[PDB]
Amino acid sequence: QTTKQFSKVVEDLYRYVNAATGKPAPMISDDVYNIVMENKDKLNSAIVYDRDFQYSYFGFKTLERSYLLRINGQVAERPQHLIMRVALGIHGRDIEAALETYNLMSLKYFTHASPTLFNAGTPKPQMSSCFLVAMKEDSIEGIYDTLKECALISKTAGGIGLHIHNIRSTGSYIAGTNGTSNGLIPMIRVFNNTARYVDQGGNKRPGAFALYLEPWHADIFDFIDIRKNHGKEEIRARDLFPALWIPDLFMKRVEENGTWTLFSPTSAPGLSDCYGDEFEALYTRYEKEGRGKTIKAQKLWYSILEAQTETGTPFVVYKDACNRKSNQKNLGVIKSSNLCCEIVEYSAPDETAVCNLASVALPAFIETSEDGKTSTYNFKKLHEIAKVVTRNLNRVIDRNYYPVEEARKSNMRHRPIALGVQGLADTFMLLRLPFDSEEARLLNIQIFETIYHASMEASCELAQKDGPYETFQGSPASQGILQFDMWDQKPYGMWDWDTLRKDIMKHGVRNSLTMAPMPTASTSQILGYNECFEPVTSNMYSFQVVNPYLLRDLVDLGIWDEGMKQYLITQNGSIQGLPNVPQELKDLYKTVWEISQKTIINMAADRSVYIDQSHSLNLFLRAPTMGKLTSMHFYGWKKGLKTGMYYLRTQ
Amino acid sequence: QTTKQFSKVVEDLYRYVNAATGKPAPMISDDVYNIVMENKDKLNSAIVYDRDFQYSYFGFKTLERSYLLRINGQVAERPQHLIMRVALGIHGRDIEAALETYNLMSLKYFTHASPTLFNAGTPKPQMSSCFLVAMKEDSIEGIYDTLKECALISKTAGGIGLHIHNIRSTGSYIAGTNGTSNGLIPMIRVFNNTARYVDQGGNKRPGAFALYLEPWHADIFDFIDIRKNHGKEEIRARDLFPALWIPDLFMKRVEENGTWTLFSPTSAPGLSDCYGDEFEALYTRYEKEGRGKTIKAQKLWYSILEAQTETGTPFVVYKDACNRKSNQKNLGVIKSSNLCCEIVEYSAPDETAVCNLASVALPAFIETSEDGKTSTYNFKKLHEIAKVVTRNLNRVIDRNYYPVEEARKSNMRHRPIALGVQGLADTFMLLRLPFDSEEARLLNIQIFETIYHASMEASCELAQKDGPYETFQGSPASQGILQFDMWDQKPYGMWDWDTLRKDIMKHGVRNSLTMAPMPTASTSQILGYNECFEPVTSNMYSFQVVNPYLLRDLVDLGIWDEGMKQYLITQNGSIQGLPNVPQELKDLYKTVWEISQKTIINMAADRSVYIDQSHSLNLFLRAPTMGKLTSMHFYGWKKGLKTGMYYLRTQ
Ligand SMILES: Nc1ncnc2c1ncn2[C@@H]1O[C@H](COP(=O)(O)OP(=O)(O)NP(=O)(O)O)[C@@H](O)[C@H]1O
Ligand SMILES: Nc1ncnc2c1ncn2[C@@H]1O[C@H](COP(=O)(O)OP(=O)(O)NP(=O)(O)O)[C@@H](O)[C@H]1O
Ligand SMILES: Nc1ccn([C@@H]2O[C@H](COP(=O)(O)OP(=O)(O)O)[C@@H](O)[C@H]2O)c(=O)n1
Ligand SMILES: Nc1ccn([C@@H]2O[C@H](COP(=O)(O)OP(=O)(O)O)[C@@H](O)[C@H]2O)c(=O)n1
Ligand SMILES: [Mg+2]
Ligand SMILES: [Mg+2]
Known part of the structure; x- marks a missing residue:
């Protein structure tokens, strides 16, 4: 039911007019149109339409449902067209690069995240999947600029992590009136409402900001309860996700069964702009000084656990782990993660962090290439592909249209990248490996060591052509300190790390960060593999x-x-x-509810040393209990995880 | 229960510290403090504390409730202190002016509107009562700047009229997505939410934006229903007031019983940036062109009437009447009234209109000064006071702190002023005049002729000292066209209009506008007279x-x-x-429910020719009916009223 020739499909898409309005509404960019036109034979005959039959029924209908570009409501694009469009949007005149990407994607080696698929090669090429926003200031002016910026961002694909540790809490003093602040909840209601008003493109996916708060904030009790389904209404915000930005001290006090003290950021300035010991010093001192409200640590902790048990939120991300082990630490203190708890990037009133995402299809590197009939894993082809995906994401940074000035500032300075994976459960099953096998544990480590090593290597080549990123000097990477080092660990050693460190110190890297395995919610469905790195549900x-x-x-x-x-x-x-x-x-x-959550944490723990950023660690408890969850939080914390927990999935 | 000496009270207020925080929180401005200090004998011995016994029980408790400045929750200010503070805040070093104002206010001749009473003489002297805001642009950027500005304004005393005729309606096309606009209601929900979040100072008076829309807007049906108490929820906005900005054509089509056509402002640009014939031409032509959705005028009109019957809103303000008869017409086309339907001032993305308000106490000019025991009205003392109140309001413009840059731009250019009245029902009763008497009709006209004539005269003197306002050239006033002229009427002629017109053409006036009789909701209560110009309820x-x-x-x-x-x-x-x-x-x-609404309209009609701006005409129907209200709207329209209707009060 579709025009076969691709340049012919690009012609329609580009010439499109909205009959209802007489407005010319082209859906291919000038750039990309011209490339297609000036190389139409090469491009048309490179496409192999057999590969459309690589997609499951339920996978293709995802593509058709909301991915393949429509003309007047009828589907205009064949799956191969969407790929070839993407490949061109990323690569421009680099027909060779474009042609390579096409093949690997068509053949299901890897894919880019949904915004890239939606928008690559189109006039408004917003290809980024996540945005990390800083609350500009503890003022009405600051609140509504930030509100304005979230709206502007929400206008295009991609979710927002927004941190708000600096907003004064209920009952805090305001100069200029005998009025008293109402704190976070009413403000959170403003954000929630904005999230309901601005469609994402023009859409079926409702709200989606995740809000990051440190547990010492005075408004924390209500904050964590934002997704409850009874209490009141005006005390809730049901289209946002509360996330905890937890410092070690909080967990220490819970463990010790001690006191915990809640400050308004104005009675206790600077808590979020430091970490580790310095934070502990500053926090202990304010606490001695009478500046806040002390209660029993375990009273908060017990509440956080109810919230997770009922709503699967708030998410848990360890602030110190994130900050201690980021190659962005030279930039200043990192205040939040993103919507899906996988990005760990620096942000400020004037720099809103962005990431571009692609995922590698782990099953595609299986071969029974031995002789008889025993499979192996082609860690060589995997390293090769990961190098390609790195190159892609890096181009995307430059051909990307930024929704707001603070996002373009951020990315052009640090150029963070985010690679991840899908079909890890499939890979285990195909290689006849129980998820909890010593083999699967070994394969995990190995796979992740190779993606990291490749992406870092490919980035090093890039720095060689185009210079290191602007802020590489003074980074841990510039000092020969790569991710696993910061975990005080030798790499597994399947790849030659000395040589790489050697080149990186000499030449730089193009990206501040490269790895942030993500949920792959829809893209896993497209290629028909199991989400990211979780066992089957x-x-x-x-x-x-x-x-x-x-x-x-x-x-x-x-x-x-x-x-x-x-x-x-x-x-x-x-x-x-x-x-x-x-x-x-x-x-x-x-099933996942049958694997020990301890093994899950470990394999997370293990792969975590090859992860620049973090990953979307969902926890699954079958018969949930206060103490059972308690031990799962603390076990991960102690492993030094960054994302201790994404969703608590239950029942 | 209060320190007697005034400089002693100013000392406390000024030296005040917030014990709970250690923050020095002075409530007198530096300016005013110094004046009080450098003239403490003059000022202390000018006060007469007997005048505190001029206030009814229920009037004083209004002053104490929320007017007199508090120190740590105890009342610090005597009523005389509040006045003397006000007089100084307005007059600065002009101790003579200050001393005069004190006397007239203490003696209950007139008073300033609540913001002036709250804030005069304090460090954040936001003395203005109303703000007329233009929606900056039909964009996400434009919507959220305007949102931001409303918030910033709501932070201080004073209500917002905001017009939104340029926001594209439900289902309108958006370049850049296959998304379709959701129109006014969801957007209105954003504003409503912001109005609930920003206290006015730190407060007990909840929302309060009035929204101005022209009835041809495609989203009108829902728009008018914003205050209903059933339908849905997400289709309502219960803390805002819908106001109709009605063009004559709409009323013609209702009368004629004809068609009426609804456009999105994007299928039909420019409707709100013209009026009178030109509008009619432009509207008729779009309507011929198929650009909108035609329905039966009376289907809309019947709906507007339900809304008014159930909710007393939407308010009705005639767009053409307002624009045809404004001395601001040289500035461009006026797009809205204010929260209380009395201000009629020009606004644009970059100019947000402001007004300062004071009301004259009409009863204070009654004397039985004849001989025996028959009262008369001292139109001389009234003219005198009105001249004083004009001078005051004009100073306020310069000593005012503006909440946003677009308000300071606006006021410094055009310097509009707003005088009004209270106790008109009292004045009638004291002079033994039924509200519907030929005498009361005569007194109305006379009173209003004298306030207008004075305010214009006092303004003319001001222009002589300090220059005309920046935009006086090209105004109707500059062409010898004053308000009543624009109603094609000779003035009643109690004052010498030729001489005044003579001087105004020669010298200018200091204010673009001067009269806008307002509701006096709280200030009438303070002086203990009946609200503004309405009969007793x-x-x-x-x-x-x-x-x-x-x-x-x-x-x-x-x-x-x-x-x-x-x-x-x-x-x-x-x-x-x-x-x-x-x-x-x-x-x-x-009672008001016993006076013919026809007489009310007439006396409004009559005083209306001495009103630069408009006035807050509430209508009262005892046994309301579709047709009974229908005739009341049309009667006023035909009289050429500007504010055809404020609230429809019922039961
Ligand atoms: N009218 C208001 N209603 C609700 N919250 C307010 C209001 N004014 C201030 N706030 C809150 O107070 C904090 C500071 O706001 P801001 O506008 O900077 O106050 P300010 O008037 O500049 N005085 P301050 O900042 O206290 O020196 C923010 O968290 C606001 O949310
Ligand atoms: N994601 C969105 N969700 C809801 N409303 C939107 C969205 N994008 C645009 N609008 C509405 O569309 C109108 C225009 O918004 P604007 O952001 O200027 O669109 P644009 O992308 O610049 N394209 P256009 O203005 O149509 O040329 C405003 O009334 C917005 O409310
Ligand atoms: N439903 C979703 C899913 C992801 N996202 C964003 O995309 C990132 C991860 O997306 P994902 O792993 O579900 O991948 P795709 O849906 O792009 O395949 C998150 O960091 C979010 O910012 C979103 O905005 N809404
Ligand atoms: N409850 C109120 C009353 C008036 N106002 C504003 O003040 C103006 C008229 O006020 P009013 O006639 O009630 O007078 P006061 O309450 O100042 O005595 C209107 O134009 C409104 O903008 C308000 O914001 N809230
Ligand atoms: Mg401030
Ligand atoms: Mg636009």
């Missing part, structure tokens, strides 16, 4: 498709009948305690 | 005090017993059809 997922790797095996052992199909609906994806299934299969197809 | 008002002029008479005819007191509770203030009361008394103490 069920084997049935749900219009009810059975795990292909399971199903395959179930027929090979010929134990698949109606008794099997119904048991899967019945036990919703669990194959454990089921009469006629080999232990091998059971260990292999454990 | 009852004779009992309500903790249940009886009309003093009635009560007086009831004892003189000795017909006052318990039978009387209860009948008044029973019939809630009506003395009509009551067995033992003289016709004279009945005609005199008609």
Whole structure:
């Protein structure tokens, strides 16, 4: 049901007019149109339309649902067109680069995040997925500029992490009136309302700011309860996500079972603009000085746990871990993560942090390339692809249209990048590895060591052509301190780290950061693999498709009948305690609610030393309990995780 | 319960420190403090504390409730202190002017509007009562700047009229996405929320923006229903007031029983930036061109009437009447009135109109100064006072602190002023005049002719000292066209208009506008007179005090017993059809729901020719009906009123 020739599809898209208004509304950029026109034979005959049959039913309908460009409501783009469009939007005149990217993407080696897919090659090429915004000032002027900026950003694809540690709390003094501040909640209500008013493009995905607060803020109790479904209404903000920016001290006081003290940022200035010991000194001293309100640490902590149990939020991100181990630490103190708890980047009133995202398809590097029929992992092809994806993301920074001036300032200075992964559960299943196997633990480490090593290497080459990023001098990277070093650990050593460190000190890197494995919520669905790096949630997922790797095996052992199909609906994806299934299969197809949360934390802990930034660590508790969750928070904290917890998923 | 000496009270107020914070929080300005200090004997011995006993019980507790400055929650200011503070805040070093104002105010000749009383002589002297704001642009950037500006203004005393005729309506096209606009309502929800978040000072008076829209706007149906108490929720905005900016054509089409056509301002640009014939031409032409959605005029009109019947809003202000008859017409087309439908001033993205307000106490100019015992009205003393009040308001413009740059731009250019009145019902009762008497009709005209004539004269003297306002050249006033001229009417001629016109053409005036009789909601209560220019709402008002002029008479005819007191509770203030009361008394103490709305419109109509601006014409219907209200709208329209209707008060 679609024009076949690609330049012919680019012609329609570009010449498009809105009949209802007589307005010429071209959907390809001038730039990209011209490239397509000046290289139409090369480009048209490079496309292979067979690759459209690489997409599952439920994967393609995601592409058609909201990805492939429409003309007057009918789908205009074939999946191959969307890719070729993307490849050109990223690469411009670099037809060779463009052609390479096309192939790897078409063949499902990797893909870019949804904004890139939406907007690459179009006149408003907003290709970035996340924005980290600083509250400009503790003033009415400051609040409404920030409000204005969130709106302007929300106008285009991508979510906002916004931190608000500097907004004075309920009842704080205001010079100029006998009026008293109402604190965070009423203000949060303003933001919530703005998030409901500005569509993201023109859309079906409602609100989406995540709000970052440090637990010493005086308004914290209400703040954490923002997503509750009863209390009052005007005390809630149901389209935002509260996230805790937790300092170590808070966890120490919980552990010690001691006191915790709540300040308005105005009775206690500077808490968020320092960390580690210095923070502890400054905090202890204010606390001695009578400046705040002391209560029992565990009273807060018990409340945070209710919130998580009921709403799966607030998220938990360790402030010190993030700041101690960032290559951006030379820039100043990092005040928040992003919407999905994976970006860890510096922000200020005048610099709003951005990231571009792509994910590598881990299954595509499996081969039974030995001889007989035993699979291996081509860590070489993986390193190769990761180098390509690095190059792409870096170009995107320059061909990107920024929604606001503070985002362009930020990115052009530090050029952070974000690579991640999907299909890790698939990769384990295909290689016949239980998620909790010593093998899967080894494969995790290995995969992540290779993506990091490649991305850093490819970035080093880039710095060689185009100079290091503006703020590379004085960074930990400039001092030969890469991520794992900052975790006081030797790398696993599958790649030659000395040589790389050697070159990086000599030449710089192009990006301040490179890795931030993300949720892959929709892009995993497109390529038909399991989200990012989490185990399967069920084997049935749900219009009810059975795990292909399971199903395959179930027929090979010929134990698949109606008794099997119904048991899967019945036990919703669990194959454990089921009469006629080999232990091998059971260990292999454990659902996520059947893997120890301790193993999850560990494999997170392990891969974490090859992660510039952080990752979207969801926790899954089957039969949740105050103490059971308590130990999971503290275990991760102690591992030195940055994102201790994204969502608490329950039931 | 208060320090007696005034400089001693100014000392405390000025030296004040917030114990809870250690912050020095002075409540007198440096300026004013110094003046008080350098003239302490003159100032201390000028005060007469007997005049504190000029205030009714219920009047004083208004002063104490929220007017007299507090120190740590205890009242610090005596009523005389508040006045002397005001007089100084307005006059600075002009101790002579200051001393005069003190006397007239203390003696209850006139008073300034609540912001002036709150803030005069204090460090943040925001003395203005109303702000007329232009929506900056049909963009996200424009919406949120305007939002920001409303917030900044709401921070200090004074209400906002904001017009939004240029915001594209539901379903309008947006370049850059396949998204479609959601129009006014969601946007209105943003404003509503901001109005709930920013206290006015630090306060008990909740929201308060009035929104001005022209009835051809495509989103009008919902817009008018903003204050309803059922429908949905997210379709309402319950802390704002919808006001209609109605062009004559709309009323013509209703009358004719014809068609009416709704445009998005983007399918039909320029409708709000013209008026009279030119508008009609432009509107007729768009309407021929298919650009909008036609429906039956009376379908809208019937809806507007439901809204008014249920919610008393939307207000009605005639766009053409306002624009045809403004001395500001040289500035460009006027797009809105203010919160209380009395200011009619020009505004633009870069110029937000302001007004300063004072009201004259009409009863204070009654004397039985003849000989025997027959009262007259001292139109001479009234003209004298009105000259003083003009001078005051004009100083306020210069000693005022502006909440935003667009307000200071506006006022320094055009210097509009707003005088009004209170106790007109009292004046009628004291002079033994039924509100509908040929005498009261004559007195109305006379009073208003004298305030206007004085204010214009006093302004002319001012222009002589300090130059005309910047934009006087090309104004109707510069061409010898004063208000009544623009109504094609000879003045009543109690004052010598030729000489004045003569001087004005020669020398200019200091103010673009001078008269805008306002609601006097709280200041009438302070001086203990009936609101502005409306008849009494009852004779009992309500903790249940009886009309003093009635009560007086009831004892003189000795017909006052318990039978009387209860009948008044029973019939809630009506003395009509009551067995033992003289016709004279009945005609005199008609409640407002007993005066023909036709007489009200007329006396409005009459005084309207001496009103630069407009006035807050509330309508009162006892047994309301579609057609009964219909005739009241059209009657006023035809009279050429500007504010056809403020609130529709019912029951
Ligand atoms: N009218 C108001 N309503 C609600 N909150 C307010 C108001 N005025 C100030 N605030 C809050 O007070 C804080 C400071 O606002 P800002 O406008 O800077 O105050 P300011 O008048 O400049 N005085 P200050 O900042 O206290 O020296 C912000 O957190 C505001 O949210
Ligand atoms: N993401 C969005 N959500 C809701 N309303 C929007 C959005 N983008 C634009 N609008 C509305 O569209 C109108 C124009 O906004 P603006 O930001 O100027 O659009 P633009 O992207 O500049 N394109 P255009 O103005 O149509 O040429 C305003 O009335 C906005 O309220
Ligand atoms: N529903 C979503 C998902 C992601 N995002 C943003 O995109 C980033 C991660 O997206 P994701 O992992 O779901 O990837 P895609 O949906 O781009 O495939 C987050 O940092 C968010 O800022 C969003 O705004 N809304
Ligand atoms: N409750 C009120 C009353 C008036 N006002 C503003 O003050 C002007 C008229 O006030 P008013 O007639 O009630 O007079 P005062 O309350 O100043 O005595 C209006 O134009 C409004 O802008 C307000 O903001 N809130
Ligand atoms: Mg401030
Ligand atoms: Mg625009």
